[PDB]
Amino acid sequence: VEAFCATWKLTNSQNFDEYMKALGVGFATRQVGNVTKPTVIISQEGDKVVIRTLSTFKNTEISFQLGEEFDETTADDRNCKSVVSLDGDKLVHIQKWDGKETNFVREIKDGKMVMTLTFGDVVAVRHYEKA
Ligand SMILES: CC/C=C\C/C=C\C/C=C\C/C=C\C/C=C\C/C=C\CCC(=O)O
């Protein structure tokens, strides 16, 4: 987890538009999700782990304890029951709403943070570089 503690900037993403289409996110929000390069701040603040995503179209922010379910209102406005946890060396984020489930895997790869987002059989990848 200390490995993920830093300010990160999106440097590249692939197939993110289709992943969003699957999630059922509206046209107005995907346009925004396609041209924005968010700054993701991950840190440990006291007892919890905080994940802040800064964008000029939306500023989110989810604080939690590993292994503990919590409520989350996503950028595309889906109220989910989420859980963030460590699986060996990867940070796994799982979101559950309307009988559905999508998950994000964040892992450190050759200097960078690789984020794999998957929904059913649809996969999207995002690369992050430290500030
Ligand atoms: C629960 C946190 C949700 C969203 C964070 C806020 C803004 C993200 C940017 C644009 C909104 C577009 C789509 C919302 C759906 C999924 C967002 C997935 C990952 C966040 C991107 C990242 O890690 O920088």
Side-chain angles (χ1 to χ4, degrees):
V1 53
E2 305 82 39
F4 302 100
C5 285
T7 289
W8 306 81
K9 295 182 62 193
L10 199 219
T11 64
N12 187 67
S13 68
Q14 258 181 171
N15 195 210
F16 190 49
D17 185 49
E18 210 62 40
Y19 170 81
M20 290 190 284
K21 263 267 66 177
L23 218 59
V25 311
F27 191 38
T29 298
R30 283 191 296 131
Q31 278 290 293
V32 164
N34 281 315
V35 298
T36 171
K37 280 184 185 174
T39 298
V40 181
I41 305 169
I42 306 175
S43 61
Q44 307 194 235
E45 305 190 358
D47 247 4
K48 35 222 56 182
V49 177
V50 187
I51 299 174
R52 265 175 285 245
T53 315
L54 302 162
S55 117
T56 44
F57 321 81
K58 259 243 156 84
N59 273 358
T60 102
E61 123 158 51
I62 297 181
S63 45
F64 57 76
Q65 311 189 69
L66 296 163
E68 263 206 11
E69 194 175 294
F70 65 94
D71 292 315
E72 158 189 77
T73 296
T74 67
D76 49 330
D77 307 293
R78 284 142 51 232
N79 299 288
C80 315
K81 258 44 173 55
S82 310
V83 175
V84 181
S85 60
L86 237 163
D87 188 315
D89 69 274
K90 318 180 194 310
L91 234 209
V92 177
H93 192 336
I94 299 174
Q95 292 176 167
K96 306 173 185 182
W97 76 105
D98 307 336
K100 298 169 172 60
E101 192 190 312
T102 187
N103 80 74
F104 318 138
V105 179
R106 294 183 174 101
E107 62 184 300
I108 304 311
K109 216 70 202 185
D110 195 28
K112 307 191 192 70
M113 172 170 84
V114 178
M115 183 178 294
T116 292
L117 304 76
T118 163
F119 185 56
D121 290 298
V122 179
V123 188
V125 178
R126 291 184 70 238
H127 289 59
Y128 284 103
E129 285 193 281
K130 288 182 175 186

PDB file of all heavy atoms in Angstrom, residues 66-90:
ATOM      1  N   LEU A  66      -9.311  -1.225   4.404  1.00  0.00           N
ATOM      2  CA  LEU A  66      -9.191  -2.401   3.573  1.00  0.00           C
ATOM      3  C   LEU A  66     -10.069  -3.522   4.089  1.00  0.00           C
ATOM      4  O   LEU A  66     -10.116  -3.792   5.291  1.00  0.00           O
ATOM      5  CB  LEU A  66      -7.733  -2.857   3.536  1.00  0.00           C
ATOM      6  CG  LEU A  66      -6.738  -1.890   2.898  1.00  0.00           C
ATOM      7  CD1 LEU A  66      -5.329  -2.298   3.308  1.00  0.00           C
ATOM      8  CD2 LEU A  66      -6.914  -1.881   1.371  1.00  0.00           C
ATOM      9  N   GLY A  67     -10.773  -4.169   3.168  1.00  0.00           N
ATOM     10  CA  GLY A  67     -11.641  -5.273   3.529  1.00  0.00           C
ATOM     11  C   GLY A  67     -13.009  -4.866   4.047  1.00  0.00           C
ATOM     12  O   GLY A  67     -13.847  -5.732   4.288  1.00  0.00           O
ATOM     13  N   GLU A  68     -13.246  -3.568   4.230  1.00  0.00           N
ATOM     14  CA  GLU A  68     -14.546  -3.117   4.720  1.00  0.00           C
ATOM     15  C   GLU A  68     -15.420  -2.460   3.663  1.00  0.00           C
ATOM     16  O   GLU A  68     -15.015  -1.506   3.002  1.00  0.00           O
ATOM     17  CB  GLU A  68     -14.388  -2.157   5.893  1.00  0.00           C
ATOM     18  CG  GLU A  68     -14.524  -2.819   7.254  1.00  0.00           C
ATOM     19  CD  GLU A  68     -14.987  -1.841   8.338  1.00  0.00           C
ATOM     20  OE1 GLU A  68     -15.399  -0.707   7.987  1.00  0.00           O
ATOM     21  OE2 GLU A  68     -14.941  -2.214   9.535  1.00  0.00           O
ATOM     22  N   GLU A  69     -16.633  -2.982   3.524  1.00  0.00           N
ATOM     23  CA  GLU A  69     -17.598  -2.463   2.561  1.00  0.00           C
ATOM     24  C   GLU A  69     -18.017  -1.056   2.974  1.00  0.00           C
ATOM     25  O   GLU A  69     -18.122  -0.761   4.160  1.00  0.00           O
ATOM     26  CB  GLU A  69     -18.820  -3.379   2.515  1.00  0.00           C
ATOM     27  CG  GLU A  69     -19.752  -3.157   1.344  1.00  0.00           C
ATOM     28  CD  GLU A  69     -20.875  -4.194   1.298  1.00  0.00           C
ATOM     29  OE1 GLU A  69     -20.581  -5.393   1.085  1.00  0.00           O
ATOM     30  OE2 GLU A  69     -22.051  -3.809   1.476  1.00  0.00           O
ATOM     31  N   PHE A  70     -18.238  -0.194   1.989  1.00  0.00           N
ATOM     32  CA  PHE A  70     -18.658   1.179   2.237  1.00  0.00           C
ATOM     33  C   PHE A  70     -19.534   1.646   1.075  1.00  0.00           C
ATOM     34  O   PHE A  70     -19.559   1.003   0.019  1.00  0.00           O
ATOM     35  CB  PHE A  70     -17.424   2.083   2.390  1.00  0.00           C
ATOM     36  CG  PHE A  70     -16.584   2.199   1.141  1.00  0.00           C
ATOM     37  CD1 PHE A  70     -16.789   3.245   0.245  1.00  0.00           C
ATOM     38  CD2 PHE A  70     -15.570   1.278   0.875  1.00  0.00           C
ATOM     39  CE1 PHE A  70     -15.996   3.374  -0.888  1.00  0.00           C
ATOM     40  CE2 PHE A  70     -14.775   1.400  -0.255  1.00  0.00           C
ATOM     41  CZ  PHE A  70     -14.984   2.448  -1.136  1.00  0.00           C
ATOM     42  N   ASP A  71     -20.276   2.731   1.270  1.00  0.00           N
ATOM     43  CA  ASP A  71     -21.120   3.253   0.197  1.00  0.00           C
ATOM     44  C   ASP A  71     -20.292   4.185  -0.661  1.00  0.00           C
ATOM     45  O   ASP A  71     -19.435   4.908  -0.156  1.00  0.00           O
ATOM     46  CB  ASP A  71     -22.309   4.046   0.732  1.00  0.00           C
ATOM     47  CG  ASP A  71     -23.320   3.179   1.454  1.00  0.00           C
ATOM     48  OD1 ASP A  71     -23.673   2.091   0.947  1.00  0.00           O
ATOM     49  OD2 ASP A  71     -23.775   3.612   2.530  1.00  0.00           O
ATOM     50  N   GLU A  72     -20.555   4.188  -1.957  1.00  0.00           N
ATOM     51  CA  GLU A  72     -19.800   5.048  -2.846  1.00  0.00           C
ATOM     52  C   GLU A  72     -20.686   5.617  -3.934  1.00  0.00           C
ATOM     53  O   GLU A  72     -21.478   4.906  -4.558  1.00  0.00           O
ATOM     54  CB  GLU A  72     -18.639   4.263  -3.473  1.00  0.00           C
ATOM     55  CG  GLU A  72     -18.079   4.725  -4.661  1.00  0.00           C
ATOM     56  CD  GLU A  72     -17.107   3.678  -5.184  1.00  0.00           C
ATOM     57  OE1 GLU A  72     -17.554   2.660  -5.750  1.00  0.00           O
ATOM     58  OE2 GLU A  72     -15.889   3.890  -5.043  1.00  0.00           O
ATOM     59  N   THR A  73     -20.572   6.915  -4.143  1.00  0.00           N
ATOM     60  CA  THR A  73     -21.324   7.573  -5.193  1.00  0.00           C
ATOM     61  C   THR A  73     -20.262   7.868  -6.239  1.00  0.00           C
ATOM     62  O   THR A  73     -19.380   8.703  -6.029  1.00  0.00           O
ATOM     63  CB  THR A  73     -21.965   8.875  -4.690  1.00  0.00           C
ATOM     64  OG1 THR A  73     -22.926   8.562  -3.676  1.00  0.00           O
ATOM     65  CG2 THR A  73     -22.659   9.608  -5.822  1.00  0.00           C
ATOM     66  N   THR A  74     -20.339   7.166  -7.361  1.00  0.00           N
ATOM     67  CA  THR A  74     -19.352   7.333  -8.404  1.00  0.00           C
ATOM     68  C   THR A  74     -19.517   8.585  -9.244  1.00  0.00           C
ATOM     69  O   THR A  74     -20.519   9.299  -9.136  1.00  0.00           O
ATOM     70  CB  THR A  74     -19.321   6.098  -9.311  1.00  0.00           C
ATOM     71  OG1 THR A  74     -20.544   5.997 -10.045  1.00  0.00           O
ATOM     72  CG2 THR A  74     -19.146   4.839  -8.458  1.00  0.00           C
ATOM     73  N   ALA A  75     -18.518   8.843 -10.080  1.00  0.00           N
ATOM     74  CA  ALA A  75     -18.515  10.010 -10.950  1.00  0.00           C
ATOM     75  C   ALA A  75     -19.715   9.987 -11.888  1.00  0.00           C
ATOM     76  O   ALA A  75     -20.300  11.028 -12.182  1.00  0.00           O
ATOM     77  CB  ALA A  75     -17.219  10.054 -11.746  1.00  0.00           C
ATOM     78  N   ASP A  76     -20.084   8.798 -12.356  1.00  0.00           N
ATOM     79  CA  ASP A  76     -21.226   8.668 -13.252  1.00  0.00           C
ATOM     80  C   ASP A  76     -22.519   8.523 -12.460  1.00  0.00           C
ATOM     81  O   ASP A  76     -23.561   8.173 -13.006  1.00  0.00           O
ATOM     82  CB  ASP A  76     -21.042   7.481 -14.200  1.00  0.00           C
ATOM     83  CG  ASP A  76     -20.633   6.214 -13.487  1.00  0.00           C
ATOM     84  OD1 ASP A  76     -19.958   6.278 -12.435  1.00  0.00           O
ATOM     85  OD2 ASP A  76     -20.969   5.130 -13.998  1.00  0.00           O
ATOM     86  N   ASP A  77     -22.423   8.790 -11.159  1.00  0.00           N
ATOM     87  CA  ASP A  77     -23.553   8.763 -10.234  1.00  0.00           C
ATOM     88  C   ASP A  77     -24.263   7.421 -10.019  1.00  0.00           C
ATOM     89  O   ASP A  77     -25.482   7.306 -10.187  1.00  0.00           O
ATOM     90  CB  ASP A  77     -24.565   9.826 -10.652  1.00  0.00           C
ATOM     91  CG  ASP A  77     -23.938  11.207 -10.794  1.00  0.00           C
ATOM     92  OD1 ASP A  77     -23.501  11.787  -9.771  1.00  0.00           O
ATOM     93  OD2 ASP A  77     -23.883  11.715 -11.938  1.00  0.00           O
ATOM     94  N   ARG A  78     -23.487   6.407  -9.657  1.00  0.00           N
ATOM     95  CA  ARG A  78     -24.029   5.087  -9.364  1.00  0.00           C
ATOM     96  C   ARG A  78     -23.756   4.922  -7.885  1.00  0.00           C
ATOM     97  O   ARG A  78     -22.627   5.113  -7.444  1.00  0.00           O
ATOM     98  CB  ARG A  78     -23.290   3.976 -10.124  1.00  0.00           C
ATOM     99  CG  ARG A  78     -23.630   3.864 -11.596  1.00  0.00           C
ATOM    100  CD  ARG A  78     -22.386   3.525 -12.393  1.00  0.00           C
ATOM    101  NE  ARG A  78     -21.690   2.381 -11.831  1.00  0.00           N
ATOM    102  CZ  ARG A  78     -20.400   2.357 -11.511  1.00  0.00           C
ATOM    103  NH1 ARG A  78     -19.629   3.424 -11.685  1.00  0.00           N
ATOM    104  NH2 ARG A  78     -19.884   1.251 -11.006  1.00  0.00           N
ATOM    105  N   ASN A  79     -24.782   4.588  -7.119  1.00  0.00           N
ATOM    106  CA  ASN A  79     -24.596   4.394  -5.693  1.00  0.00           C
ATOM    107  C   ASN A  79     -24.245   2.927  -5.531  1.00  0.00           C
ATOM    108  O   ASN A  79     -25.061   2.049  -5.777  1.00  0.00           O
ATOM    109  CB  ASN A  79     -25.873   4.783  -4.950  1.00  0.00           C
ATOM    110  CG  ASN A  79     -26.227   6.238  -5.160  1.00  0.00           C
ATOM    111  OD1 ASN A  79     -25.560   7.145  -4.633  1.00  0.00           O
ATOM    112  ND2 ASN A  79     -27.259   6.481  -5.957  1.00  0.00           N
ATOM    113  N   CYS A  80     -23.005   2.674  -5.132  1.00  0.00           N
ATOM    114  CA  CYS A  80     -22.513   1.313  -4.998  1.00  0.00           C
ATOM    115  C   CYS A  80     -22.145   0.892  -3.584  1.00  0.00           C
ATOM    116  O   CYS A  80     -22.072   1.705  -2.676  1.00  0.00           O
ATOM    117  CB  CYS A  80     -21.273   1.138  -5.891  1.00  0.00           C
ATOM    118  SG  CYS A  80     -21.393   1.824  -7.600  1.00  0.00           S
ATOM    119  N   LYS A  81     -21.938  -0.409  -3.425  1.00  0.00           N
ATOM    120  CA  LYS A  81     -21.480  -1.001  -2.179  1.00  0.00           C
ATOM    121  C   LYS A  81     -20.089  -1.473  -2.603  1.00  0.00           C
ATOM    122  O   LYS A  81     -19.947  -2.440  -3.353  1.00  0.00           O
ATOM    123  CB  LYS A  81     -22.356  -2.186  -1.773  1.00  0.00           C
ATOM    124  CG  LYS A  81     -23.377  -1.880  -0.676  1.00  0.00           C
ATOM    125  CD  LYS A  81     -24.090  -0.559  -0.917  1.00  0.00           C
ATOM    126  CE  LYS A  81     -25.228  -0.326   0.094  1.00  0.00           C
ATOM    127  NZ  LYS A  81     -24.780  -0.402   1.523  1.00  0.00           N
ATOM    128  N   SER A  82     -19.063  -0.785  -2.128  1.00  0.00           N
ATOM    129  CA  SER A  82     -17.705  -1.108  -2.521  1.00  0.00           C
ATOM    130  C   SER A  82     -16.789  -1.650  -1.446  1.00  0.00           C
ATOM    131  O   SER A  82     -17.043  -1.524  -0.249  1.00  0.00           O
ATOM    132  CB  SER A  82     -17.050   0.138  -3.136  1.00  0.00           C
ATOM    133  OG  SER A  82     -17.881   0.704  -4.131  1.00  0.00           O
ATOM    134  N   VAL A  83     -15.698  -2.244  -1.901  1.00  0.00           N
ATOM    135  CA  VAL A  83     -14.686  -2.789  -1.024  1.00  0.00           C
ATOM    136  C   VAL A  83     -13.335  -2.671  -1.712  1.00  0.00           C
ATOM    137  O   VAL A  83     -13.180  -3.056  -2.875  1.00  0.00           O
ATOM    138  CB  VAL A  83     -14.928  -4.280  -0.711  1.00  0.00           C
ATOM    139  CG1 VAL A  83     -13.773  -4.820   0.121  1.00  0.00           C
ATOM    140  CG2 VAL A  83     -16.236  -4.461   0.033  1.00  0.00           C
ATOM    141  N   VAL A  84     -12.361  -2.120  -1.003  1.00  0.00           N
ATOM    142  CA  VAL A  84     -11.028  -2.009  -1.550  1.00  0.00           C
ATOM    143  C   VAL A  84     -10.176  -2.949  -0.719  1.00  0.00           C
ATOM    144  O   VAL A  84     -10.326  -3.027   0.493  1.00  0.00           O
ATOM    145  CB  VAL A  84     -10.489  -0.565  -1.465  1.00  0.00           C
ATOM    146  CG1 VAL A  84      -9.094  -0.484  -2.084  1.00  0.00           C
ATOM    147  CG2 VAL A  84     -11.429   0.370  -2.202  1.00  0.00           C
ATOM    148  N   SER A  85      -9.301  -3.699  -1.368  1.00  0.00           N
ATOM    149  CA  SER A  85      -8.464  -4.613  -0.622  1.00  0.00           C
ATOM    150  C   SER A  85      -7.145  -4.888  -1.316  1.00  0.00           C
ATOM    151  O   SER A  85      -6.931  -4.514  -2.479  1.00  0.00           O
ATOM    152  CB  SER A  85      -9.208  -5.929  -0.396  1.00  0.00           C
ATOM    153  OG  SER A  85      -9.542  -6.529  -1.638  1.00  0.00           O
ATOM    154  N   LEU A  86      -6.254  -5.535  -0.581  1.00  0.00           N
ATOM    155  CA  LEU A  86      -4.956  -5.908  -1.098  1.00  0.00           C
ATOM    156  C   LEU A  86      -5.016  -7.398  -1.415  1.00  0.00           C
ATOM    157  O   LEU A  86      -5.551  -8.192  -0.634  1.00  0.00           O
ATOM    158  CB  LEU A  86      -3.882  -5.639  -0.049  1.00  0.00           C
ATOM    159  CG  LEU A  86      -2.735  -4.718  -0.445  1.00  0.00           C
ATOM    160  CD1 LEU A  86      -2.036  -4.261   0.814  1.00  0.00           C
ATOM    161  CD2 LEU A  86      -1.764  -5.445  -1.401  1.00  0.00           C
ATOM    162  N   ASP A  87      -4.491  -7.763  -2.576  1.00  0.00           N
ATOM    163  CA  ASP A  87      -4.445  -9.149  -3.016  1.00  0.00           C
ATOM    164  C   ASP A  87      -2.991  -9.378  -3.403  1.00  0.00           C
ATOM    165  O   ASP A  87      -2.617  -9.223  -4.565  1.00  0.00           O
ATOM    166  CB  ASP A  87      -5.349  -9.340  -4.236  1.00  0.00           C
ATOM    167  CG  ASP A  87      -5.503 -10.805  -4.638  1.00  0.00           C
ATOM    168  OD1 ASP A  87      -4.492 -11.549  -4.687  1.00  0.00           O
ATOM    169  OD2 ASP A  87      -6.648 -11.206  -4.923  1.00  0.00           O
ATOM    170  N   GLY A  88      -2.158  -9.706  -2.416  1.00  0.00           N
ATOM    171  CA  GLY A  88      -0.756  -9.937  -2.692  1.00  0.00           C
ATOM    172  C   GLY A  88       0.015  -8.646  -2.896  1.00  0.00           C
ATOM    173  O   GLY A  88       0.655  -8.149  -1.976  1.00  0.00           O
ATOM    174  N   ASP A  89      -0.044  -8.087  -4.097  1.00  0.00           N
ATOM    175  CA  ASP A  89       0.679  -6.850  -4.376  1.00  0.00           C
ATOM    176  C   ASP A  89      -0.215  -5.860  -5.107  1.00  0.00           C
ATOM    177  O   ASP A  89       0.172  -4.712  -5.315  1.00  0.00           O
ATOM    178  CB  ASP A  89       1.912  -7.154  -5.236  1.00  0.00           C
ATOM    179  CG  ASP A  89       1.539  -7.577  -6.647  1.00  0.00           C
ATOM    180  OD1 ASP A  89       1.280  -8.783  -6.866  1.00  0.00           O
ATOM    181  OD2 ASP A  89       1.484  -6.700  -7.541  1.00  0.00           O
ATOM    182  N   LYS A  90      -1.412  -6.316  -5.476  1.00  0.00           N
ATOM    183  CA  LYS A  90      -2.390  -5.502  -6.195  1.00  0.00           C
ATOM    184  C   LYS A  90      -3.506  -4.932  -5.307  1.00  0.00           C
ATOM    185  O   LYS A  90      -3.951  -5.559  -4.344  1.00  0.00           O
ATOM    186  CB  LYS A  90      -3.064  -6.328  -7.291  1.00  0.00           C
ATOM    187  CG  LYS A  90      -2.136  -7.228  -8.093  1.00  0.00           C
ATOM    188  CD  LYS A  90      -2.925  -7.994  -9.156  1.00  0.00           C
ATOM    189  CE  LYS A  90      -2.104  -9.149  -9.740  1.00  0.00           C
ATOM    190  NZ  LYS A  90      -0.746  -8.665 -10.156  1.00  0.00           N
TER     191      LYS A  90
END
